[PDB]
Amino acid sequence: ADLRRAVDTALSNNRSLRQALLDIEAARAQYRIQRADRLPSINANASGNRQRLPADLSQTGRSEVTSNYQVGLGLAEYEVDLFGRVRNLSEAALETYLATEEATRATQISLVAEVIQAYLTRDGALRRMALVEQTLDSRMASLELVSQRRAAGAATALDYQEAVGLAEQARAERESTERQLRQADNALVLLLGTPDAARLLPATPRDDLMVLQDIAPGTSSELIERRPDILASEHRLKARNADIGAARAAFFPRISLTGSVGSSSAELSGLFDGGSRAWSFAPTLSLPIFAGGRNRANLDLAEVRQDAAVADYEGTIQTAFREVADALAATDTLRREEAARQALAGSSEAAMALAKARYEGGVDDYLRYLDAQRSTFSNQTTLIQISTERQIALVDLFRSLG
Amino acid sequence: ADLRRAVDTALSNNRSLRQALLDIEAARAQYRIQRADRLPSINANASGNRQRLPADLSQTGRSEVTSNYQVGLGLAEYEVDLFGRVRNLSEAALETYLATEEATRATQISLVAEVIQAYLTRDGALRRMALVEQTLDSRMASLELVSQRRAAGAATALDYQEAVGLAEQARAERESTERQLRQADNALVLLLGTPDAARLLPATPRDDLMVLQDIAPGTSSELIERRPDILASEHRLKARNADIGAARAAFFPRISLTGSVGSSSAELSGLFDGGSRAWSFAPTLSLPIFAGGRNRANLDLAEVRQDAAVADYEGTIQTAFREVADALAATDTLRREEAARQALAGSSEAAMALAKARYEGGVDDYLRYLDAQRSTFSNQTTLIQISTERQIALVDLFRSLG
Amino acid sequence: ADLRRAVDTALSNNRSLRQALLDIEAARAQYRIQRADRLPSINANASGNRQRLPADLSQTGRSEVTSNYQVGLGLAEYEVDLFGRVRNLSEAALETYLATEEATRATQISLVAEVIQAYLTRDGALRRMALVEQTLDSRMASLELVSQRRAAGAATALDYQEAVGLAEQARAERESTERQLRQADNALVLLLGTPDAARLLPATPRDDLMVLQDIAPGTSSELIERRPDILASEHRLKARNADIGAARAAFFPRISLTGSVGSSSAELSGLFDGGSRAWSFAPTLSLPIFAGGRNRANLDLAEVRQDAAVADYEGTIQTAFREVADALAATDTLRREEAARQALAGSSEAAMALAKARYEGGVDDYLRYLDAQRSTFSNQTTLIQISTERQIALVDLFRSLG
């Protein structure tokens, strides 16, 4: 329940997700930029050229100056396309935008998985703190009791020293778990991206289930169509195919019309006089009859780049298969390992029942009971470690499946 | 033996390796592109310009219309190079291609190293599974025996509980080793890059020698001459020197030759008529007498980049030296460590022989013999871990030596 | 004291630091390139064009050939700016240079941190070697003593075997510590960057204070004003905020002045004749009245990029906060953990003193005294790991604080 709230807070507030969404907007931006090329590029051109062979003659000087002033609209190099290398670049940018969309979706999924994993780590750390704190209390009781035994003379100073060492070891273990818990809290507050994230998280552990325990892997073909990074690789491959199309179109002759319409006169005063509405059409065909590789090696470059995109697609698919298979193996083995560790914890708890029965029966002293307590609580905390690690493995499996 | 088969399968099928050779074909294509600039670049130009000062007059209107149609060949701004800045870019691309060749060779070497290391890890994991399976069988034997002793009343429930806990601990250990083995298989499958990779590997481990156990490091100068990434950095430094040459050439005047040949007429009907075989010839000397840093800042940028390439080359040399030194230290220490661990395993085996002699002699019960079994089994698997890690260290040493 | 010498050697000699400094020189050069655009770009242009409708007529042929030769200076497209898009690019280059300065400062401080951490690791490894060497000596002494006891028939071969195994385990531990020490030495010599770096480091550990033990974190705002990476992110944000200004200026009309001055003649002989001193001076107003998204998408791309820079700045702030919080938590918990471990080491020391008193008193065996020595040396060496890790945590806290 709180996982959903934390994930919502992250998606609303995490900075890396905002960066990814802005990458989305920028991909749309250059897609629009490239798409603008297909449409006419007409601009208002107001140019005045003063050219003359002798010197001086400024501001209507005494010479044969020709001062042309061309003011009007100009079609700035339209490229009508037989194959649409402009169009090829256009849907190449479109494929880049789609790949960016898939990549941002993958980043969102990864951020959610990190949030859940850090949450689970924090919960496990809280449980381990309860366990280690009460184990240190058990060691303190044992140390005090051995201290009384030595004071009464029934114990050597060596036993007091070893009890002191055991208490120190318990303190060091508690310090290590405290450090782990603080690191987990800081990681969570970073992932949530809000300075009040320490207020949105519960202060105590709970035994409530948080993530679904059984997840069906399905087939590899389904994973191909659902995992975002594979989709991103597919879209990049499509973009590289678009680049191959552009390179192929570059072979063929390119025809461009340069147009203009406006006024022109030999003097500035006649700029807005009748009879100067000039125009210029200039269709031009360029075709390199011998490229020398200038156009060909571009084609081979695009070809090999598309092949590299194919290889990248295959490699990403294989990596995703590797990752999901690892997650499945980890989840299965960890389910069995947690079953074994739960059986072990139950065994130590049975030892608790027996040792307590003996102690209350006056057969075993308090030292044996406390030793049993420490044993069972060590077993319980090494159970919590495995449970947390299994939950993290489940989250990784969910992330891998998309 | 099967290691070479796995390496062949990887080099034939690995997707990242195919990506590397595709990067080499791309780099070669890029060099071809840059080399095409040195050779003449002519193109067939067919242009028709129609211009007139008043408006309308479309399709031979009544005015002083000026229509020009030029159809023919044209040399598009040849740069006659006194310093060969085009040539400088040429062998800069060539050095980039050679550096990419060295980098791809290094990637192939790394792929081989990972394949070998993963395969060794799989072998060690198989041995560890044998070890842990028999350790768990020992634990269950002792558990059943203690269960019988409790049933007969000769043992407390505490002993039965601790035997249960030990069996659970062994089961958890077996689950951990199973997880490790599955992950190793998955990594090997990914490295081989084929869905049938599980058929190219043996289901059982072998004690045969696998990789050469002693490798001579030689001298540092040799490591400079053989290691592929060092060669890549050297070729990149040579490329940066060629860039410095190009920037120096940019200071000097450039001779730009532009020419054309074809037909020109005032009307469309007269394009293919006699007496229109026009031609152009326009050499140009572009030399910026005051660059303002436009050409000088390019220069110290190139010199700074060449110095940075020098620093990178030295840093890569030092990194390779660190890697080979680390690999040598690891190999030596691990040889001695495996000697110690083999001595320890032999010691546990001798203790096994003595405990078995006692048990068959009727002096020690079965529990002591089973305890000796578990002890020797743990020692033997700790030996296998060191042996596997030493093999991995040898492979890392080979990889770092090129 | 030797830390200052080592870090000075690093800054003088480390190849990655020299790489960063050459990166600053490159960034300064790239800014000089961009700043050169604001200033006039004049060009000594010497061009000769020969064009005529019929064929042949080369070298003063018999036709209407026109041979125009222009030799002289030329102002190559001065862009007088109403908003300063060139000025905006200059500001962007300056911001990039400042960001690179902060990044290089960050690389320097990180290099210092790694040098100090490696040096601390080397010192701790030396202490651990002393400890493990004497632990192994104790194991060999116990092994010899048990061997002599067995030879006299007072011990079973089982005790000899277990003593042998213990000695082997101690040897394996010694090999592991030797490997760690060698790796630390190699890392240190790589960080220092000189072949004679191992000459510059002492071969013995020392107990003096090494870095300041208490460091005050201060406020978050102060860290915002001191950490180099956050300053680099701020400068990159400023660069993008100049890019958005450049894109905004791209909307507005831009004026270019193309000028020239020199000689013109219809024949080569008359190039240096009187009255040929010609010139041209040509306003051009370029303004796209209908961009079609060509400029508008550039504008929103700049907006999106600046927003992404804002997100980057915030994310880096949060990352720095996470790092300093982790460092503080680690330092505090590690201070308490080292206190506990020192108490434990003192406890084992007192236990060894008691065991020695008993042994010299003839009550305890030499085996008991040797075991007490081994226990105290194990506690003392596990103290050194905590102390070294605490020192490394302090260095990390210093690094994260800038």
Side-chain angles (χ1 to χ4, degrees):
Chain A
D2 306 317
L3 267 188
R4 289 178 200 153
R5 193 181 301 125
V7 161
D8 285 320
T9 279
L11 58 77
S12 302
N13 296 295
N14 184 270
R15 303 312 188 229
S16 310
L17 260 207
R18 286 172 55 263
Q19 253 173 319
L21 295 164
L22 292 160
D23 286 330
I24 275 300
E25 289 191 5
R28 188 267 333 283
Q30 324 118 318
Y31 159 60
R32 296 273 190 165
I33 278 274
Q34 190 44 79
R35 187 176 175 190
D37 255 32
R38 294 179 59 181
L39 280 275
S41 68
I42 62 94
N43 82 310
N45 298 302
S47 38
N49 173 32
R50 185 155 194 164
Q51 146 61 11
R52 188 45 38 230
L53 265 84
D56 319 304
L57 61 137
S58 34
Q59 279 148 24
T60 74
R62 296 93 178 111
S63 152
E64 54 285 315
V65 79
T66 66
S67 302
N68 55 61
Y69 305 98
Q70 291 153 10
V71 176
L73 325 166
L75 170 64
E77 204 95 76
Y78 206 99
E79 180 173 333
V80 306
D81 229 347
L82 70 81
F83 211 177
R85 47 175 318 290
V86 189
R87 178 186 304 164
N88 278 331
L89 293 209
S90 178
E91 94 294 348
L94 199 278
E95 291 299 327
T96 301
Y97 158 90
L98 295 181
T100 303
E101 191 175 333
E102 300 297 331
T104 289
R105 188 163 75 81
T107 310
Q108 182 185 341
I109 275 152
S110 293
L111 178 287
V112 171
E114 296 161 270
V115 163
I116 297 134
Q117 281 176 352
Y119 199 91
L120 279 158
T121 303
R122 183 190 171 274
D123 184 74
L126 281 176
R127 290 175 194 214
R128 289 204 291 260
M129 265 289 201
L131 268 280
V132 182
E133 275 275 21
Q134 75 166 320
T135 282
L136 179 57
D137 292 351
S138 177
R139 299 295 183 127
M140 280 304 167
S142 212
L143 172 57
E144 162 267 359
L145 210 62
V146 169
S147 183
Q148 252 82 71
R149 275 177 47 115
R150 174 215 170 136
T156 85
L158 170 61
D159 301 317
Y160 181 80
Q161 290 300 333
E162 67 92 4
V164 162
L166 290 208
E168 304 310 319
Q169 197 236 309
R171 281 169 187 172
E173 191 57 49
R174 178 184 168 246
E175 299 313 310
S176 195
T177 308
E178 166 70 12
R179 172 177 61 257
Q180 293 167 345
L181 173 60
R182 286 191 193 170
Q183 308 290 47
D185 279 331
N186 292 338
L188 205 76
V189 77
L190 164 70
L191 281 176
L192 291 183
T194 279
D196 288 311
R199 308 323 144 211
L200 294 174
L201 38 72
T204 209
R206 86 293 333 277
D207 273 335
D208 169 33
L209 183 159
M210 287 180 0
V211 188
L212 295 178
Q213 297 305 294
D214 293 300
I215 303 167
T219 68
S220 59
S221 42
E222 290 163 345
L223 188 271
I224 289 169
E225 262 66 8
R226 298 186 83 142
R227 178 161 180 65
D229 66 359
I230 297 174
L231 303 182
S233 64
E234 196 185 338
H235 285 302
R236 250 166 308 106
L237 163 62
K238 242 47 172 202
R240 289 307 81 61
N241 203 73
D243 291 337
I244 251 295
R248 282 185 173 179
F251 264 5
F252 274 16
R254 165 231 214 214
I255 56 200
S256 315
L257 70 149
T258 304
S260 70
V261 52
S263 181
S264 190
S265 176
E267 291 188 2
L268 190 68
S269 44
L271 186 58
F272 214 133
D273 287 345
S276 62
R277 341 280 174 181
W279 51 261
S280 73
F281 299 16
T284 304
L285 187 164
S286 186
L287 165 72
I289 189 49
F290 153 83
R294 165 57 30 53
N295 270 16
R296 182 179 173 157
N298 259 335
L299 178 291
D300 321 69
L301 174 275
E303 191 67 351
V304 60
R305 191 86 77 69
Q306 165 253 337
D307 301 337
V310 172
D312 182 15
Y313 180 71
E314 284 174 6
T316 300
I317 283 181
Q318 287 190 343
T319 295
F321 189 57
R322 158 75 199 285
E323 155 168 335
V324 298
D326 276 346
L328 280 170
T331 300
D332 181 66
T333 49
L334 283 196
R335 179 198 287 135
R336 275 180 277 131
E337 187 168 0
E338 191 195 30
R341 289 294 185 177
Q342 192 39 263
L344 170 60
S347 177
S348 58
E349 251 296 338
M352 209 28 60
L354 293 167
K356 160 137 155 281
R358 288 178 65 120
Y359 162 56
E360 310 289 340
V363 164
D364 289 350
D365 50 13
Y366 210 39
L367 270 274
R368 285 282 317 102
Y369 172 55
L370 271 279
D371 186 5
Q373 279 222 0
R374 285 130 71 183
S375 180
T376 186
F377 269 147
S378 181
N379 291 153
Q380 174 164 17
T381 173
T382 192
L383 175 287
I384 293 165
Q385 287 170 282
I386 298 305
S387 196
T388 305
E389 148 184 333
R390 182 197 162 198
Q391 292 300 304
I392 291 172
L394 280 169
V395 182
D396 260 7
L397 172 59
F398 161 75
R399 198 282 320 296
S400 58
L401 290 175
Chain B
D2 319 314
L3 203 55
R4 293 174 201 151
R5 191 182 303 124
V7 168
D8 286 319
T9 300
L11 57 78
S12 302
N13 293 294
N14 183 271
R15 302 313 191 229
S16 312
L17 195 272
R18 282 170 56 264
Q19 204 121 324
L21 294 318
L22 263 43
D23 292 325
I24 204 66
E25 288 187 8
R28 185 267 337 282
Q30 189 46 286
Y31 151 79
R32 296 270 183 164
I33 280 271
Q34 271 316 271
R35 184 179 177 189
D37 203 295
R38 298 177 63 179
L39 279 278
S41 67
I42 42 61
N43 49 67
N45 294 307
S47 51
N49 179 31
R50 193 162 202 165
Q51 210 283 106
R52 176 65 186 124
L53 190 98
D56 313 67
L57 70 138
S58 34
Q59 285 146 25
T60 72
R62 298 91 185 83
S63 155
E64 203 172 40
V65 83
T66 327
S67 301
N68 193 344
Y69 317 81
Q70 295 153 8
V71 175
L73 315 188
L75 178 72
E77 303 184 350
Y78 209 116
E79 180 169 334
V80 161
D81 223 347
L82 65 68
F83 220 155
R85 47 87 46 66
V86 184
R87 176 184 304 166
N88 278 328
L89 291 209
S90 177
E91 90 292 12
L94 200 279
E95 291 298 328
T96 301
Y97 153 90
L98 297 179
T100 301
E101 191 176 333
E102 300 295 332
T104 291
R105 180 163 85 82
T107 308
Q108 182 186 343
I109 274 151
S110 293
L111 194 297
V112 166
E114 313 152 67
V115 163
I116 274 59
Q117 283 174 354
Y119 190 94
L120 282 158
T121 303
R122 183 190 172 275
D123 187 77
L126 283 176
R127 288 174 194 215
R128 287 193 276 228
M129 268 286 201
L131 263 291
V132 182
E133 280 280 14
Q134 313 150 20
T135 283
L136 180 56
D137 291 351
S138 176
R139 298 297 182 129
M140 308 276 333
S142 316
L143 172 55
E144 161 265 3
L145 207 67
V146 169
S147 183
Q148 229 75 51
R149 295 214 333 160
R150 177 213 169 144
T156 84
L158 294 197
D159 303 317
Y160 173 45
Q161 288 300 333
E162 65 95 357
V164 162
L166 291 207
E168 304 310 318
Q169 200 280 320
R171 281 167 182 170
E173 193 56 50
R174 207 265 299 300
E175 302 312 311
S176 195
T177 309
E178 166 70 15
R179 175 178 62 257
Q180 294 168 346
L181 172 61
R182 286 191 193 170
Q183 311 275 79
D185 280 332
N186 286 4
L188 207 50
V189 151
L190 165 69
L191 284 176
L192 291 183
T194 165
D196 287 311
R199 98 193 158 171
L200 296 176
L201 34 82
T204 210
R206 303 83 30 83
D207 267 339
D208 50 7
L209 192 162
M210 259 192 143
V211 195
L212 297 181
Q213 300 303 296
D214 290 299
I215 304 167
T219 67
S220 60
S221 41
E222 286 162 344
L223 325 174
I224 293 167
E225 190 55 291
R226 300 193 83 138
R227 184 155 168 64
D229 68 356
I230 288 307
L231 304 183
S233 64
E234 193 186 339
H235 284 120
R236 152 161 25 78
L237 166 62
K238 246 41 181 202
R240 215 57 51 244
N241 200 74
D243 287 337
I244 250 286
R248 282 182 174 178
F251 260 174
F252 275 16
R254 73 143 40 105
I255 320 87
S256 327
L257 149 67
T258 307
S260 71
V261 52
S263 182
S264 185
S265 176
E267 291 187 3
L268 191 65
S269 45
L271 268 310
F272 226 127
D273 288 344
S276 64
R277 335 297 178 197
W279 51 261
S280 79
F281 199 148
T284 302
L285 303 320
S286 187
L287 166 71
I289 187 46
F290 152 82
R294 171 50 30 53
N295 210 313
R296 181 179 173 156
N298 265 340
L299 197 274
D300 38 21
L301 178 46
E303 83 105 21
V304 165
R305 210 91 90 63
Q306 178 252 335
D307 300 337
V310 171
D312 159 272
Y313 172 74
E314 285 175 6
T316 319
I317 282 181
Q318 291 187 344
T319 296
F321 194 31
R322 195 268 269 265
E323 283 183 0
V324 296
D326 278 352
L328 281 169
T331 300
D332 181 68
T333 46
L334 292 204
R335 180 199 285 137
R336 276 181 278 127
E337 184 167 359
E338 189 193 30
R341 289 294 186 178
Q342 240 291 346
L344 167 61
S347 177
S348 57
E349 251 293 343
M352 160 75 38
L354 290 166
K356 183 270 208 53
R358 289 176 64 121
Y359 156 64
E360 312 279 338
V363 158
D364 291 349
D365 49 12
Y366 209 36
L367 284 320
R368 286 278 316 100
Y369 170 57
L370 270 287
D371 171 69
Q373 282 231 6
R374 289 132 81 179
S375 180
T376 189
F377 267 121
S378 179
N379 291 154
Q380 161 166 17
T381 172
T382 318
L383 164 68
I384 290 163
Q385 298 179 260
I386 296 305
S387 187
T388 303
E389 143 191 332
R390 181 198 164 200
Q391 294 300 302
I392 292 171
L394 284 169
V395 189
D396 263 358
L397 173 58
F398 164 75
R399 192 214 58 55
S400 54
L401 288 176
Chain C
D2 310 315
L3 273 188
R4 291 174 201 151
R5 193 181 302 125
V7 305
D8 280 321
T9 300
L11 325 190
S12 301
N13 295 294
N14 182 270
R15 302 313 189 228
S16 308
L17 203 47
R18 280 166 65 264
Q19 199 112 324
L21 297 169
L22 295 160
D23 184 16
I24 207 67
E25 289 188 6
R28 185 266 334 283
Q30 184 304 347
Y31 151 84
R32 296 271 183 164
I33 274 288
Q34 200 33 259
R35 186 176 175 191
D37 188 20
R38 296 179 65 179
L39 272 295
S41 70
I42 45 62
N43 204 15
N45 305 304
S47 36
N49 172 36
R50 184 159 198 162
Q51 179 42 264
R52 187 42 53 237
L53 306 114
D56 318 84
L57 71 142
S58 42
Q59 281 151 22
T60 72
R62 295 92 186 102
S63 159
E64 199 24 66
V65 85
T66 315
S67 298
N68 214 335
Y69 312 79
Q70 308 309 311
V71 174
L73 329 168
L75 174 66
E77 309 259 0
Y78 212 102
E79 183 168 337
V80 309
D81 228 354
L82 91 166
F83 210 177
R85 53 95 45 73
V86 191
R87 182 182 304 166
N88 278 331
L89 298 212
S90 182
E91 308 141 10
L94 201 282
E95 292 300 327
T96 301
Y97 158 94
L98 296 177
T100 300
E101 192 175 333
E102 300 297 331
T104 292
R105 187 179 99 102
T107 308
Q108 182 184 343
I109 180 179
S110 292
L111 194 294
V112 169
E114 321 147 47
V115 161
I116 302 175
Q117 280 173 352
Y119 202 82
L120 290 159
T121 303
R122 186 187 174 276
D123 185 72
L126 283 173
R127 289 173 193 213
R128 286 200 278 250
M129 268 292 219
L131 260 300
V132 181
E133 278 289 344
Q134 42 191 304
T135 284
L136 182 60
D137 294 350
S138 177
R139 297 297 183 125
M140 305 294 332
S142 318
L143 171 56
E144 160 266 3
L145 210 59
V146 167
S147 183
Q148 219 127 311
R149 165 185 285 222
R150 172 216 170 142
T156 83
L158 272 38
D159 300 319
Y160 181 57
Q161 289 300 333
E162 71 98 355
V164 162
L166 288 206
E168 305 310 319
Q169 150 189 330
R171 278 164 184 169
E173 195 59 49
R174 207 265 299 290
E175 301 313 311
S176 195
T177 307
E178 166 74 14
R179 177 179 64 258
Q180 294 167 345
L181 173 61
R182 287 190 193 170
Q183 309 278 75
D185 277 331
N186 289 339
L188 199 36
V189 66
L190 164 71
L191 280 177
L192 291 183
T194 90
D196 288 311
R199 325 288 74 91
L200 296 172
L201 37 76
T204 180
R206 85 294 328 278
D207 267 339
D208 64 9
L209 188 160
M210 227 179 171
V211 296
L212 294 180
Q213 299 304 296
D214 293 300
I215 302 167
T219 68
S220 59
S221 42
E222 289 166 346
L223 179 275
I224 291 169
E225 293 312 2
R226 300 186 85 141
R227 217 196 141 146
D229 50 350
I230 213 54
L231 302 180
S233 65
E234 194 186 338
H235 284 302
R236 254 171 287 108
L237 166 60
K238 246 42 175 199
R240 304 293 85 67
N241 196 72
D243 285 336
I244 183 149
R248 282 183 174 178
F251 267 12
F252 272 16
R254 75 119 199 87
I255 321 90
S256 185
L257 329 178
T258 298
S260 69
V261 47
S263 181
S264 187
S265 175
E267 292 187 2
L268 193 67
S269 46
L271 261 306
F272 217 143
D273 283 346
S276 61
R277 335 290 152 161
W279 40 255
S280 74
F281 181 162
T284 281
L285 194 300
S286 190
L287 164 70
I289 179 54
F290 156 79
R294 164 58 21 64
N295 279 15
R296 183 179 172 157
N298 225 65
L299 201 283
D300 55 53
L301 175 274
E303 292 177 347
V304 165
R305 195 76 87 63
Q306 177 253 335
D307 299 337
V310 171
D312 187 333
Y313 172 74
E314 284 180 8
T316 318
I317 280 181
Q318 290 187 343
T319 297
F321 194 70
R322 193 270 261 273
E323 284 185 2
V324 296
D326 282 356
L328 280 172
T331 298
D332 182 68
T333 46
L334 283 199
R335 179 198 286 136
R336 276 180 278 128
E337 187 169 1
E338 189 193 29
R341 289 293 185 178
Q342 238 293 340
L344 167 61
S347 177
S348 57
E349 254 287 347
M352 170 185 63
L354 289 170
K356 151 144 164 26
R358 289 176 64 121
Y359 160 54
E360 307 281 337
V363 164
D364 282 352
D365 203 324
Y366 200 50
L367 274 274
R368 293 282 317 102
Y369 170 80
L370 276 193
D371 184 46
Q373 284 222 8
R374 282 134 75 182
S375 181
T376 191
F377 282 139
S378 182
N379 292 153
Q380 164 172 359
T381 178
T382 197
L383 163 68
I384 294 160
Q385 329 212 40
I386 297 307
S387 163
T388 305
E389 164 182 344
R390 183 194 165 197
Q391 295 301 302
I392 291 171
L394 282 169
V395 176
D396 265 355
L397 172 58
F398 161 75
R399 197 218 50 67
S400 55
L401 287 176

